[PDB]
Structure formats: C-alpha cells, structure tokens
Short mmCIF file of C-alpha atoms in Angstrom, two decimals:
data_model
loop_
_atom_site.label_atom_id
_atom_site.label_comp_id
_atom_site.label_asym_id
_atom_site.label_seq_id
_atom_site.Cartn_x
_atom_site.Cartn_y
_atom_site.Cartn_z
CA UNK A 1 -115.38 76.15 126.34
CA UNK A 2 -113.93 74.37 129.44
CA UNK A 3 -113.40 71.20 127.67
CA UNK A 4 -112.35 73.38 124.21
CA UNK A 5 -109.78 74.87 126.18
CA UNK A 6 -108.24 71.29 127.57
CA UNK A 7 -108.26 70.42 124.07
CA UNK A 8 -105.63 73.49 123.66
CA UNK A 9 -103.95 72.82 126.71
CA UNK A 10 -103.31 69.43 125.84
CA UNK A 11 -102.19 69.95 121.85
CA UNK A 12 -100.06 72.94 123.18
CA UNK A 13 -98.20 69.92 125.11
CA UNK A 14 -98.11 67.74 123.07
CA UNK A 15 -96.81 70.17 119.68
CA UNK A 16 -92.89 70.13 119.07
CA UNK A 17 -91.13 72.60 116.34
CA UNK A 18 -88.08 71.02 115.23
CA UNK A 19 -89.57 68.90 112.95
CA UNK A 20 -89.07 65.79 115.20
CA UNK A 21 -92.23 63.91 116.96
CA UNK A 22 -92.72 60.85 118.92
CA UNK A 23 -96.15 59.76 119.28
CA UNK A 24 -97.16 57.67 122.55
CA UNK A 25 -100.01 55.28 121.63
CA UNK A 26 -101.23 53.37 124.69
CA UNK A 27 -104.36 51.57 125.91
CA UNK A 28 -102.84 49.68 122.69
CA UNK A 29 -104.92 46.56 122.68
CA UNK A 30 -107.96 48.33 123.21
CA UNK A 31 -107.30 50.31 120.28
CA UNK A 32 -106.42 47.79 118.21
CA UNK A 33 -109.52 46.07 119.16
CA UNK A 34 -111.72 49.07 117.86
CA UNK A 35 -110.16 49.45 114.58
CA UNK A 36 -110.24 45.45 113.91
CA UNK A 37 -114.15 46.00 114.56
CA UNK A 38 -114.29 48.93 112.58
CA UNK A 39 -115.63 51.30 114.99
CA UNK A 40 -112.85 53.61 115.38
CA UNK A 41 -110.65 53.01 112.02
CA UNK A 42 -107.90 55.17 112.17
CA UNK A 43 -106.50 57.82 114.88
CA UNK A 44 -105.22 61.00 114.28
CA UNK A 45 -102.27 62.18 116.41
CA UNK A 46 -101.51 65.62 118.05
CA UNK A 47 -100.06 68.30 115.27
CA UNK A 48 -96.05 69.58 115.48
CA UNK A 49 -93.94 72.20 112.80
CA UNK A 50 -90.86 72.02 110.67
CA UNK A 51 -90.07 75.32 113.04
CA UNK A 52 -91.82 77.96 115.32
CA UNK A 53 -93.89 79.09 112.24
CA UNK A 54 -93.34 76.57 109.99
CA UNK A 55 -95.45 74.02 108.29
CA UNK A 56 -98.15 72.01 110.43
CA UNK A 57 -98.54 68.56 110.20
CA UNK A 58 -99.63 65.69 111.86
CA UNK A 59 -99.43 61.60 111.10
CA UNK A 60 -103.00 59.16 110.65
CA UNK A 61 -102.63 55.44 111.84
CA UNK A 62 -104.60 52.62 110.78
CA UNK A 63 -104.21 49.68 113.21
CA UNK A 64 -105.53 47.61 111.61
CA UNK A 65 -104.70 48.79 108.41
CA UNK A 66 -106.34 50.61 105.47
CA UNK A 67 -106.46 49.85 101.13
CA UNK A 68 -103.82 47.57 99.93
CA UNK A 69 -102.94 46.66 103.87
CA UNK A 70 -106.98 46.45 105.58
CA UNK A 71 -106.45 43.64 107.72
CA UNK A 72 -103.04 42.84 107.32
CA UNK A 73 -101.20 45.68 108.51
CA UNK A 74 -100.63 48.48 110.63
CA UNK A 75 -100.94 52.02 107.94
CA UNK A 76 -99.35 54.87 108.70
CA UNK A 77 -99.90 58.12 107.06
CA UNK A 78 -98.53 61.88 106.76
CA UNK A 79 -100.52 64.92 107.35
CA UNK A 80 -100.15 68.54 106.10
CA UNK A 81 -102.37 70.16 108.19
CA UNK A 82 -103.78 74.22 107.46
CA UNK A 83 -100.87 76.41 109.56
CA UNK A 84 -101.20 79.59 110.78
CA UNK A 85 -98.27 80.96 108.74
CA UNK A 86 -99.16 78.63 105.45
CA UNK A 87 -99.05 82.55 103.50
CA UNK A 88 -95.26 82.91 104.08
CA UNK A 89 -94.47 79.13 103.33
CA UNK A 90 -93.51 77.63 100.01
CA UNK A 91 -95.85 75.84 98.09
CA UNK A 92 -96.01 72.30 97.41
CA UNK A 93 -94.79 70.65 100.71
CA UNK A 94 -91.21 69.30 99.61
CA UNK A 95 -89.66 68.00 102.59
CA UNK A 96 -88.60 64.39 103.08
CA UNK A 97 -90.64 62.94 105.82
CA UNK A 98 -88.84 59.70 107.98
CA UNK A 99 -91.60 57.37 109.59
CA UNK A 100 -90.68 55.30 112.31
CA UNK A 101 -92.46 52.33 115.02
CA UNK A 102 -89.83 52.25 117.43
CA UNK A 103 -88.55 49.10 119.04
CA UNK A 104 -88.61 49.38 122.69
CA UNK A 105 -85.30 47.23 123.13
CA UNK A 106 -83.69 49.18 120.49
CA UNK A 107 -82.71 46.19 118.59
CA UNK A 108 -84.89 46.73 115.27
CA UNK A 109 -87.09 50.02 114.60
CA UNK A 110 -89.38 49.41 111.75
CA UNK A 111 -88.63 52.72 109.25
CA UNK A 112 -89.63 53.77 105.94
CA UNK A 113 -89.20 57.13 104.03
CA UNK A 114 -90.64 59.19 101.09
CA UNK A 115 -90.04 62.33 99.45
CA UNK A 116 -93.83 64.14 98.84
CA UNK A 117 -95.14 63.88 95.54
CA UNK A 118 -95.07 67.37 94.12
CA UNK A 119 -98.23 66.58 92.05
CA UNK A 120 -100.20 65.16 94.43
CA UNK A 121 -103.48 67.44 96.35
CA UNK A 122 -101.97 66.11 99.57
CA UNK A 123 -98.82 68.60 99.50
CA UNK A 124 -100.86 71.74 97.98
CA UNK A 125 -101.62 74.45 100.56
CA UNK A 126 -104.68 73.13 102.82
CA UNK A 127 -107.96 74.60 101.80
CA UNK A 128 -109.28 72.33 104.55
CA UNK A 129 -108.27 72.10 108.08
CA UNK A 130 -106.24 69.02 106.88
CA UNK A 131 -105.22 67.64 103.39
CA UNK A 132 -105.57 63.61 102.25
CA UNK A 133 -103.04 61.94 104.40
CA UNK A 134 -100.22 59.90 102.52
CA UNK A 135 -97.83 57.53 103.25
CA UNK A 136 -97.24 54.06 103.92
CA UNK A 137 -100.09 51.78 103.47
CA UNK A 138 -97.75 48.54 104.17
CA UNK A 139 -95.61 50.15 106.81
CA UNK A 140 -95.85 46.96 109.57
CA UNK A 141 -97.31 44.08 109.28
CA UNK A 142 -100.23 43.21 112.08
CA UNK A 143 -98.10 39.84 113.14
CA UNK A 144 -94.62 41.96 113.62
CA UNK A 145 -95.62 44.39 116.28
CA UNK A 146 -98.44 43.43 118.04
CA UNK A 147 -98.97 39.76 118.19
CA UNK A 148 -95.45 39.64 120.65
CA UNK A 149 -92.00 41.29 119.79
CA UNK A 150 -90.72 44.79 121.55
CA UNK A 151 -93.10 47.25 119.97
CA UNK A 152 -96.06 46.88 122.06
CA UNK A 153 -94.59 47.06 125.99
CA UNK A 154 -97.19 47.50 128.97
CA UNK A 155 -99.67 47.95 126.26
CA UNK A 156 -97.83 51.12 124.43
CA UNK A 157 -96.31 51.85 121.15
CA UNK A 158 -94.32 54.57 119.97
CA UNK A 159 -94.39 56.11 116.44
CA UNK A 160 -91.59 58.42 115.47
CA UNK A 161 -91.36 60.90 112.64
CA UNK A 162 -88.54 63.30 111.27
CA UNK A 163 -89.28 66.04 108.96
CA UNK A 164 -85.90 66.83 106.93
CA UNK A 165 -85.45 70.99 106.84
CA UNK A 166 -82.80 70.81 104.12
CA UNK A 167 -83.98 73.98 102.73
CA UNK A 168 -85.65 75.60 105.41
CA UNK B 1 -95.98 58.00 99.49
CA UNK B 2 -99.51 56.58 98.80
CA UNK B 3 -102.45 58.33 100.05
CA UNK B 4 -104.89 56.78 102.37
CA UNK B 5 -108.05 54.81 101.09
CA UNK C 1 -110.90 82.78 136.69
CA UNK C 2 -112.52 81.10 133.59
CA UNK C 3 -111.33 83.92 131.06
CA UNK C 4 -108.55 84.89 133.05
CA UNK C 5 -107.27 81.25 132.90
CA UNK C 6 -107.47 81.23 129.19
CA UNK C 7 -105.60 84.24 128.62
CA UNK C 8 -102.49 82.58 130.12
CA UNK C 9 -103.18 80.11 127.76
CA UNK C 10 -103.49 82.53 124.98
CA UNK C 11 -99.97 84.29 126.12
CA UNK C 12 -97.99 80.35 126.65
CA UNK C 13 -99.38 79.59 123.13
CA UNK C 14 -97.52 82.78 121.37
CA UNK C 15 -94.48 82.92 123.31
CA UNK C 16 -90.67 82.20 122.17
CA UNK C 17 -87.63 82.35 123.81
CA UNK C 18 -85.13 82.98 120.93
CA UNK C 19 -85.65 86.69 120.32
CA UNK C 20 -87.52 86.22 117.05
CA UNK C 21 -91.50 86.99 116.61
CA UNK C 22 -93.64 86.61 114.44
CA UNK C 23 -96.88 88.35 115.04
CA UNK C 24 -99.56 87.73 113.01
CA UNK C 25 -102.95 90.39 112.75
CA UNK C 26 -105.82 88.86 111.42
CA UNK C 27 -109.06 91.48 110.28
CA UNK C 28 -106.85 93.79 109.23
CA UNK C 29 -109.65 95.59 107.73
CA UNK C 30 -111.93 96.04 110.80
CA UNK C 31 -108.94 96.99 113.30
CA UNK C 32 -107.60 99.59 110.91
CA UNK C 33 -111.39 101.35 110.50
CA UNK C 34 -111.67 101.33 114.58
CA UNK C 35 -108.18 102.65 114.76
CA UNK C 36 -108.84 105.54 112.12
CA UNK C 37 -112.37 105.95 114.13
CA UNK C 38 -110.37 106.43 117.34
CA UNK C 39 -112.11 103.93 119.24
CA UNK C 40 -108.75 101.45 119.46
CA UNK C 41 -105.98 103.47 118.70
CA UNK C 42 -103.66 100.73 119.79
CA UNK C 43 -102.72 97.32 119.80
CA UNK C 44 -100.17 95.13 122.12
CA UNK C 45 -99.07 91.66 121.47
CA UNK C 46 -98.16 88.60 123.03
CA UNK C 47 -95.04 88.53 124.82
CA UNK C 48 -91.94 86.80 123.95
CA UNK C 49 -88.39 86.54 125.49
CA UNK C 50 -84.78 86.65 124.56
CA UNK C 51 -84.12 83.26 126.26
CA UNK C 52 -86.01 80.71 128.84
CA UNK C 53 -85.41 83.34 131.70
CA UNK C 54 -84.37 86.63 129.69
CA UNK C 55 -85.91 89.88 129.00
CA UNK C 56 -90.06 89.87 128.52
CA UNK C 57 -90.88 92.06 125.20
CA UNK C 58 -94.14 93.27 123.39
CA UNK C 59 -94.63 95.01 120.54
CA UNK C 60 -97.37 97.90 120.19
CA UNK C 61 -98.73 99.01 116.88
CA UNK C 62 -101.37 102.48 115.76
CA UNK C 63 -102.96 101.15 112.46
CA UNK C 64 -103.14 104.95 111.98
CA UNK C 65 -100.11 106.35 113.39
CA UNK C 66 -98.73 107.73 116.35
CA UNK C 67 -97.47 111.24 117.01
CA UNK C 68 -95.51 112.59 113.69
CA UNK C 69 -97.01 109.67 112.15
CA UNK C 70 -100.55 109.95 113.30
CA UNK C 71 -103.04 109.85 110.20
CA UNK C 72 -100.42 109.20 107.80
CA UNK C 73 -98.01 106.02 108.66
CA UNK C 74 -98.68 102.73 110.44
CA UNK C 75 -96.72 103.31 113.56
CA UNK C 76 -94.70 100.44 115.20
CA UNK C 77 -93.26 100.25 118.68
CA UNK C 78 -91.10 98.31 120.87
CA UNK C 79 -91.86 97.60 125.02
CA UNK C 80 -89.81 96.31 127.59
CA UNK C 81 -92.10 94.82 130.30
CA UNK C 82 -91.52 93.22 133.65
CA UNK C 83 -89.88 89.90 133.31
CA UNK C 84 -90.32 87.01 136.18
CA UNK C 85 -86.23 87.35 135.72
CA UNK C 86 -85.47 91.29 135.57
CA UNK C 87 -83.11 90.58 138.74
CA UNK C 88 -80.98 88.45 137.09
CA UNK C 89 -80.54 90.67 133.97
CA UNK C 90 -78.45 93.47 133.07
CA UNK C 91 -79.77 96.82 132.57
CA UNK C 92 -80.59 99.12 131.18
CA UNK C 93 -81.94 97.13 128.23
CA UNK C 94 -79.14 97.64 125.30
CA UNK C 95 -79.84 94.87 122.46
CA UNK C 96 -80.51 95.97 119.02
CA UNK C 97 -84.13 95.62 117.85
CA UNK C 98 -85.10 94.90 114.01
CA UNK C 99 -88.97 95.52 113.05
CA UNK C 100 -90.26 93.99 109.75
CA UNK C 101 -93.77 94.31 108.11
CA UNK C 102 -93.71 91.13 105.89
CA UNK C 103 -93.84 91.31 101.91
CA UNK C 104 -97.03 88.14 101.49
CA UNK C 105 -94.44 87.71 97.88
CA UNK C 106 -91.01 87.92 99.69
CA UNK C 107 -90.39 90.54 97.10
CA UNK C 108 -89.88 93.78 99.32
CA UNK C 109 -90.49 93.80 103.16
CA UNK C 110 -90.25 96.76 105.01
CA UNK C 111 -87.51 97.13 107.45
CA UNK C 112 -85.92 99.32 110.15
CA UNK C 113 -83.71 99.00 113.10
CA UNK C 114 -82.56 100.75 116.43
CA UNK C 115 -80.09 100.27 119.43
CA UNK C 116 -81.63 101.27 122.49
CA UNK C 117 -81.34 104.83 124.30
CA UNK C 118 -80.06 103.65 126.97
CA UNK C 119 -80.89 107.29 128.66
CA UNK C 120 -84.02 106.99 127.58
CA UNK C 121 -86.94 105.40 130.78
CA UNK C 122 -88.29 102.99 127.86
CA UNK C 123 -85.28 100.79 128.59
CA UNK C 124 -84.45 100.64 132.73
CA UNK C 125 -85.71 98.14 134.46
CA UNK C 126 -89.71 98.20 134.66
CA UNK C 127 -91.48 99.38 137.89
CA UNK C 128 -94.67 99.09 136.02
CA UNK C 129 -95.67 96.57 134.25
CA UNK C 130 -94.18 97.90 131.04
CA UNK C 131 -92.15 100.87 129.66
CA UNK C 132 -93.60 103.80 127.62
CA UNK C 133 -93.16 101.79 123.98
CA UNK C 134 -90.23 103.52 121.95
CA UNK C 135 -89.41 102.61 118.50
CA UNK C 136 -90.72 103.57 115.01
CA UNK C 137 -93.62 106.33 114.60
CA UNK C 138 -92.90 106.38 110.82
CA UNK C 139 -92.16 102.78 110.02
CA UNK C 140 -94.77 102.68 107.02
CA UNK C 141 -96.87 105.00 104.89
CA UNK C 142 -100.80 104.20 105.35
CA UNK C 143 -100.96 103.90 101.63
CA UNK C 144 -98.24 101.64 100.89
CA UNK C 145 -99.53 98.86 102.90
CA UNK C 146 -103.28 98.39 103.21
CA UNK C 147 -104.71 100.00 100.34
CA UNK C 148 -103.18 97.43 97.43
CA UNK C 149 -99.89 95.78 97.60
CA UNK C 150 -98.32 92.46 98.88
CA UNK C 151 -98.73 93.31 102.60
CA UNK C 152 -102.09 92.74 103.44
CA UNK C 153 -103.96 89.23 101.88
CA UNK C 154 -106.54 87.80 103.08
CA UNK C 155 -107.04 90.33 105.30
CA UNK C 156 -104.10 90.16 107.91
CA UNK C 157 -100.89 91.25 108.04
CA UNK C 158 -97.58 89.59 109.34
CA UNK C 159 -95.34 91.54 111.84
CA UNK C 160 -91.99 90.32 112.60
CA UNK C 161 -89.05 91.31 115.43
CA UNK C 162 -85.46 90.29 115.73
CA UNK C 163 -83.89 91.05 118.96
CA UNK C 164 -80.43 90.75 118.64
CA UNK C 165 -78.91 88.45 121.33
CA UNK C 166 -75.02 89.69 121.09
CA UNK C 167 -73.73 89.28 124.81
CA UNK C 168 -76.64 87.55 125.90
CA UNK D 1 -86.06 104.58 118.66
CA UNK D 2 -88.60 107.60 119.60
CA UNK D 3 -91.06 106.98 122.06
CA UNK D 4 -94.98 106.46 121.64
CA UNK D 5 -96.81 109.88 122.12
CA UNK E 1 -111.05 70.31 137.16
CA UNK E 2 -111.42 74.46 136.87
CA UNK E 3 -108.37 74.00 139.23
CA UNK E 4 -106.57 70.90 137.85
CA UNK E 5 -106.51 72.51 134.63
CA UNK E 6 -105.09 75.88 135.87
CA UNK E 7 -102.38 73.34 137.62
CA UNK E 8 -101.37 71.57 134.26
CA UNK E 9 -100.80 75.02 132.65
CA UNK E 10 -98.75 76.35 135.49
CA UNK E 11 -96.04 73.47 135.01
CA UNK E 12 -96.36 74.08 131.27
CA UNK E 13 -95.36 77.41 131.98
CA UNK E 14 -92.74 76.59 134.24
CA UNK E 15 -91.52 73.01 131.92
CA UNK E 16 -87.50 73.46 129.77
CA UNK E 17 -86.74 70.96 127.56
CA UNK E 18 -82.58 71.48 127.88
CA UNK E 19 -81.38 70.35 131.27
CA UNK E 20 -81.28 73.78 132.51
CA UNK E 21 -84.01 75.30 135.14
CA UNK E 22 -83.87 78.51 137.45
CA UNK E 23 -86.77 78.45 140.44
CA UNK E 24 -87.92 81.45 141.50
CA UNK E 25 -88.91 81.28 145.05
CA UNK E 26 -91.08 84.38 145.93
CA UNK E 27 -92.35 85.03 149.70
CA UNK E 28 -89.20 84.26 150.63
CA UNK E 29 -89.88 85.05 154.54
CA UNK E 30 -93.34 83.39 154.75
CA UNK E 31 -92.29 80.33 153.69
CA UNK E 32 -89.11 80.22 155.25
CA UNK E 33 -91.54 80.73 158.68
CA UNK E 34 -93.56 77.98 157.28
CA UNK E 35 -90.55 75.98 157.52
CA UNK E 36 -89.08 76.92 160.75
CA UNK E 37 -92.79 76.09 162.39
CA UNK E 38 -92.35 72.45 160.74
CA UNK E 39 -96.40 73.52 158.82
CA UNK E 40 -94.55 72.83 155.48
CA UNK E 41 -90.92 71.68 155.96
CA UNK E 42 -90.59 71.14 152.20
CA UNK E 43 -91.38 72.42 148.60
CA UNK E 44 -91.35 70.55 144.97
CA UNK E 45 -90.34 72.79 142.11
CA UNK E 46 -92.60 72.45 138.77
CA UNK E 47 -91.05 69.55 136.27
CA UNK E 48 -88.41 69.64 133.87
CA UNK E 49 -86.90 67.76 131.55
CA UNK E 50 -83.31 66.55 129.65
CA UNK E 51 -84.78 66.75 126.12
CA UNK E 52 -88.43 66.99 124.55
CA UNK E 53 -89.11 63.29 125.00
CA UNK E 54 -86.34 62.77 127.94
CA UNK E 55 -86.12 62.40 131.40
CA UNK E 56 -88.37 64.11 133.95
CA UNK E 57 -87.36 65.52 136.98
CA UNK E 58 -88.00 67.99 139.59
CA UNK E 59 -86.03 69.55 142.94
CA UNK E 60 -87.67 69.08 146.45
CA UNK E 61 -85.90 72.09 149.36
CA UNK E 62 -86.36 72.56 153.02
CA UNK E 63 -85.88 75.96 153.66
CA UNK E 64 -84.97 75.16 157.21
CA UNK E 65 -82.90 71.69 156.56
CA UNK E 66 -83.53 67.88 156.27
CA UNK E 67 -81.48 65.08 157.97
CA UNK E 68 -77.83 66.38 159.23
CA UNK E 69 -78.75 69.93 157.51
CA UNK E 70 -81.99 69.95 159.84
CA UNK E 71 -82.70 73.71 161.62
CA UNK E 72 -78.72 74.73 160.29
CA UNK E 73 -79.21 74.57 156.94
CA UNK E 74 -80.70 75.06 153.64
CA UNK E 75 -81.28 71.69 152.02
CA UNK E 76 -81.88 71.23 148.26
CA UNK E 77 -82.37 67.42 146.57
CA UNK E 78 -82.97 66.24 143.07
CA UNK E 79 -85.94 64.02 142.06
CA UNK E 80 -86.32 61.40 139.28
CA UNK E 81 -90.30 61.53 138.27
CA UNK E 82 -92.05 59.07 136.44
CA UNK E 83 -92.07 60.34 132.85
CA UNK E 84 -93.86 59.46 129.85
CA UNK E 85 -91.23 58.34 127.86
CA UNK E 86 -89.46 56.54 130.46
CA UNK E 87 -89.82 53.51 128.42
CA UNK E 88 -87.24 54.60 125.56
CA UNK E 89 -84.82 55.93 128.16
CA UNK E 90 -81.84 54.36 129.70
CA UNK E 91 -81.79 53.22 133.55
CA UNK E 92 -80.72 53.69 136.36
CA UNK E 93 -80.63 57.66 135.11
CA UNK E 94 -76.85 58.68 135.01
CA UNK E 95 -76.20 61.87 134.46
CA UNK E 96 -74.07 64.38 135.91
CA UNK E 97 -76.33 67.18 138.13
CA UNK E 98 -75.70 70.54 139.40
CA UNK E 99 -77.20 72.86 142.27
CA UNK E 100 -77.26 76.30 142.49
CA UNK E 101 -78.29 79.65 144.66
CA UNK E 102 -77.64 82.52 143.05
CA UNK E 103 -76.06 86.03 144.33
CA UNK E 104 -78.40 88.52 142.94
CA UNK E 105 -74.97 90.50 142.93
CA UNK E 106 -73.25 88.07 140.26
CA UNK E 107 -70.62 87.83 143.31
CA UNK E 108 -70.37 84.45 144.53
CA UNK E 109 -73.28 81.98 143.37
CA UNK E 110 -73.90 79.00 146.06
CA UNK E 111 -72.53 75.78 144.23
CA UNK E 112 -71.92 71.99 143.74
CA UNK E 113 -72.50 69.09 141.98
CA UNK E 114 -72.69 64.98 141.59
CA UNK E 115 -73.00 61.94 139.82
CA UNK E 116 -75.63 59.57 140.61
CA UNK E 117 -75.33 56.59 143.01
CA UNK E 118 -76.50 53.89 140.40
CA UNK E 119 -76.86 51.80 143.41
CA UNK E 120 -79.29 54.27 144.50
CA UNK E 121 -83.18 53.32 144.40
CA UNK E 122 -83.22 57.27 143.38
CA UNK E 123 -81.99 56.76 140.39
CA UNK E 124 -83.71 53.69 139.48
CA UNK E 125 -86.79 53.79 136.75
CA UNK E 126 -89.74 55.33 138.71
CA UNK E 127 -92.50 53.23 139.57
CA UNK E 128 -94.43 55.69 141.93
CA UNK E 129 -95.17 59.05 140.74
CA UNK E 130 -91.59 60.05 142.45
CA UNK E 131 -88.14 58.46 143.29
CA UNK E 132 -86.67 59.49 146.65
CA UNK E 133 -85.43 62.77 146.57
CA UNK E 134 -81.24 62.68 146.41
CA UNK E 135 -78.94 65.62 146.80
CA UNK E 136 -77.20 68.25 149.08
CA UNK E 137 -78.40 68.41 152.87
CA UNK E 138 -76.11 70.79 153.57
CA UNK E 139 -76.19 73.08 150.70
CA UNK E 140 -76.01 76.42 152.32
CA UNK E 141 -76.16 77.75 155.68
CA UNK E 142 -79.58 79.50 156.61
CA UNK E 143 -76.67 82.16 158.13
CA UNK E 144 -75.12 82.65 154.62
CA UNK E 145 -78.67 82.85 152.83
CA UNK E 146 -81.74 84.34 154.76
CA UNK E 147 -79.85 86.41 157.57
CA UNK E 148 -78.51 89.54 155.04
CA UNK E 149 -76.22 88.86 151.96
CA UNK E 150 -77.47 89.12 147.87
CA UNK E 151 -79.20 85.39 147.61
CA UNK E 152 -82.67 87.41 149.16
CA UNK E 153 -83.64 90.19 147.40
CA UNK E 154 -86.96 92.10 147.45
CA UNK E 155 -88.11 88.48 149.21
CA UNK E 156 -87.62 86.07 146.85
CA UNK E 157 -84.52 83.54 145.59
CA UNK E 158 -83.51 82.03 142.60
CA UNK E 159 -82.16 78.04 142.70
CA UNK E 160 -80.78 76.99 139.54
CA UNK E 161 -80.38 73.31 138.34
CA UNK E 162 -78.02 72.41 134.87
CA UNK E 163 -78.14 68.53 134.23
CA UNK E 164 -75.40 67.61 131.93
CA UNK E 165 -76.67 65.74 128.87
CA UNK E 166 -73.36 63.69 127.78
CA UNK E 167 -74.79 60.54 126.16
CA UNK E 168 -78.00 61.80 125.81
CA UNK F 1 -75.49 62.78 146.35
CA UNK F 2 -77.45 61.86 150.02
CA UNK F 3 -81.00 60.78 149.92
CA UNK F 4 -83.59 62.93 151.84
CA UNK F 5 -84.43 61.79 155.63
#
C-alpha cells in the first residue's frame, strides 16, 4: 500500500480538469530505445477530465509507432478511461479532441484533430478500466522529431492535448 | 480517429 | 502515520474550491441497512471550500432520517467546520446553500435550498472542529429514493451542493 | 435550515 | 520515503495554479525567537505556480531581517524554482510581483510591489533547484508587526503573494 | 526588487 498510495499521490499531480493536458515525456532516448526493441511498445500517460466530474481520459503513445505507422512513426492515441461520474455523463463521448507534439522553439507544433466516431466501442461508456484507444496512427514521423529538430530538448518531449467542451 | 493495432 | 497519511490523501483527492460538490455514495444498500440498524446513523463527507482560502464545508447525511425525519426521510445536512483561513473571513457564515439528490435520468432531481440563520451557533465561527450540522431533516421520503426509482443505480447515489458565492 | 437532532 | 512522501503531499496541499498564494505562518513567537537567536534566520514557503504548466516559485522571509533590514526588520523575497515546464516558458521570468502582510482587522494590509531586474541572475532560467531569492529587505518593521497591532493574531500571520499574469 | 544577502 505504500507504493499504491505514491501511485495516487503522483496521478493526483499530475490530473488537470479543464480539459487541457501537457504530457512531459523524458528519459526520451531511452524510451525510444525500448519501444524500437519491442520491449516496452507503447506508454500510457497520467489521466485528466473535461471538468471536476467530467469525463476521464488519458492519451497512449507509440514511439516507435503502431499498425499502418510500426516503424515509421511516432502513434499517438486517445483514451476514454472508466470515470467516477460516467452515470451522470452523456453517452457516446462526442467531444473534439486536439493532439499536439509541441515544438520547443515554438516555431512549428506538429497538430492533428478528430471528432470521435459515434459508432465506434472506443467512445461507448467503459465497461473496462479503459476503452480501445484511437487516434492518430501517422501523427509524426520517426525522422521529424527525434532524429534532430526542436521536439526532443535535453532528452524531453512534450505532448499536448485539448478536449473541446462545446456542450458541456 | 483510427484505433490502435 | 501510515493511515493517517492516506487520509489526507483521501480528503486533497475530493476537495474543490468553487463551492460546488459532488458527493458520490457508493453501497448504498449496505450503509442504508446499518443506518436503519442503528449501528451508523450518520455519514460526513469530504470537505470542500468556497475558494483557495475560503470557508471549509461538509455535508452530513442519516440514510434513515434525523429528528422529524427519523425512520421516514433521508435526512441531509449542511456543516461549517474550521477553515486554515476562518481569520480572514467574514462571519457569521451567510451564503445560500442548495442540496440536490441527483435524478441517474436527469428527469427529476430533488432539490431544496436555505440562507443561513445567522442567529443560529451552526454558522459563527467554529471553536470546534465543526458546527452542529443544520439544514434539511425532511429533504427526501425513504421510499421515493432507494426502494425503485432513478436515484439509486448500481447501488450508489449522487449528492450534490451549491454554495452560493454572492459577495465572496 | 433546522439543525441535526 | 514514509516521510518524503508525507512532504510531496504537504506542498500539494499547499500548491495554486493562479498567481495568487496566502502563507499562513503559525507559531508566530517561536519562530520569530528562532530568528532573533540566528538557529533559523529564514523560512521557504511551499511552491506555487502562474498557471497549471507555468512558472514555479516560492517566497523565502527572515522574521528578524536580511541585509540592510537585518535585526530592524521583517524581510520577505521572491524565488524563481526550477520547474518542470521551464522548457516551454519564456526567460528571464518577467512578470510583475506583489508582497503582502495582512491586518487581520481588514485596516491597513502591509504592501508593495516590483518588476523584475531582467539583468538579475534571479530571474534567469533556474539551473539549481533555486534562483537567488529577490525582493523587499525592508518590508515591515518588526515594531509595526510582532510588538502589538492586527498582523499577529492568536500567534500566527498571513503573507500574501499575487503575481500578475499579463502575457502569460 | 534587492537580492537576499
């Protein structure tokens, strides 16, 4: 329980509920390294809400990519994730979700958008902890960030995502 | 959006 | 230490500072047996706050009523309790309160409202660590809620408060 | 608001 | 760690996202003795920041004075920490600061205020865990405080710090 | 603002 309440400690600082979240990934080429070998594909990151008892989601990154980009790019994915408060929430997920790898001299963030697809299981409400991520399999390639560029500075990226509340 | 594989 | 440490964490983790709560009561079922059993008459929730530093507020609940209510109506109070801030504040307490017991199908929730009596000890300025509760002994018939309904599913029930922050 | 017996 | 982790969730509890903190300095006497003595001439308040992912930032005050406020005054100084998302911020920081006692009376609240030296290696981006501390040495006379007046009541003060977030 | 001593 000492370590599974760090684990609390540290989500509880990490969770945001304005439907904005910026994800710090460092130890970067390490990382990058592990999902290349295909010990540690993907990472999950830390969950946030659309509002104090909104929706909870989180975002899934491949670095090294996964389906139509395994190899060549860096796959990032959206999460609806089982909230406390799913009862009172409308059903399907229908918020626009913005996904962002931001460029640390502010020159050229990479950024890509979806609305959810209403028909898809991944915007139902979770029966599991989490539902099938979806997003952008071809968000970056590996050669853009990575290889030099201003994404990857003293061995850290930053991913940022913005969860429209139109409607909420 | 496209799910994951 | 090892408990008491993790009920801080417990209290951080449900705490807002925009007047609004949102308390959710899972095993509905159970609590309401020991409450009609008399073996927990009561319940008291987290704490929340009107602003960063503004007033601290719980809520305290009888499953199976309270005073005119007891045996017949779920009773609902409101508690003013020592805040880290109480110096800086204004008192007595005088800001409208609005208790809700959430309709699961937003069809009808059940509502009621006070201002403060500001004669009344439940809102000076705590000595103790909280005021005798004051609020609503008849907020809802036992067999509305519970028995069938939209109010309890899944076994829990949502509680929700609205202090209003007029001259805050 | 009446207070908790 | 049992006591590292309780320290991580006592600066949680004390973090704001806004620009606006109030410390609460209780034991007023003991550690203004503490001070006097020369055991601990001066105290760090817990972090705060400008915005969820802004800049992070602290206040250091000798009770009994530092440089030409030394053993006549009450000396209170900003700090610039090293923050995680220093990286996506602009340097050196530049933002307008203000520094406050306050008159548990709502009389006459100690103030002032200043814009950063940019020339200033304490408002350059942080290498070390800390900048150099930056501020008011003679903020308030220990005469005005301690000594009688509303700033001390029931042994404990509250300093209050608004950073303005123009550009930000 | 004046640094610390």
């Amino acid at each position: 329980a000492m370590a599974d309440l760090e684990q609390k400690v540290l989500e509880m600082e990490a969770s945001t509920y304005d439907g904005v979240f910026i994800w710090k990934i460092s130890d970067f080429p390490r990382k990058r390294q592990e999902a290349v070998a295909g010990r540690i594909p993907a990472i999950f990151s830390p969950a946030f809400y659309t509002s104090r008892y909104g929706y909870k989601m989180c975002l899934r990154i491949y670095l090294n990519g996964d389906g139509t980009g395994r190899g060549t790019h860096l796959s990032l994915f959206f999460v609806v994730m089982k909230g406390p408060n799913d009862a009172l929430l409308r059903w399907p997920f229908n918020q626009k979700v913005t996904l962002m790898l931001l460029d640390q001299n502010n020159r050229e963030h990479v950024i890509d958008a979806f609305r959810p697809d209403v028909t898809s299981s991944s915007f139902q409400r979770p029966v599991n902890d989490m539902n099938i991520a979806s997003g952008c399999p071809l968000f970056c390639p590996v050669s853009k960030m990575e290889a030099k560029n201003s994404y990857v500075r003293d061995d850290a990226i930053f991913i940022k995502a913005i969860v429209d509340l139109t409607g909420l | 959006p496209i799910q994951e594989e």
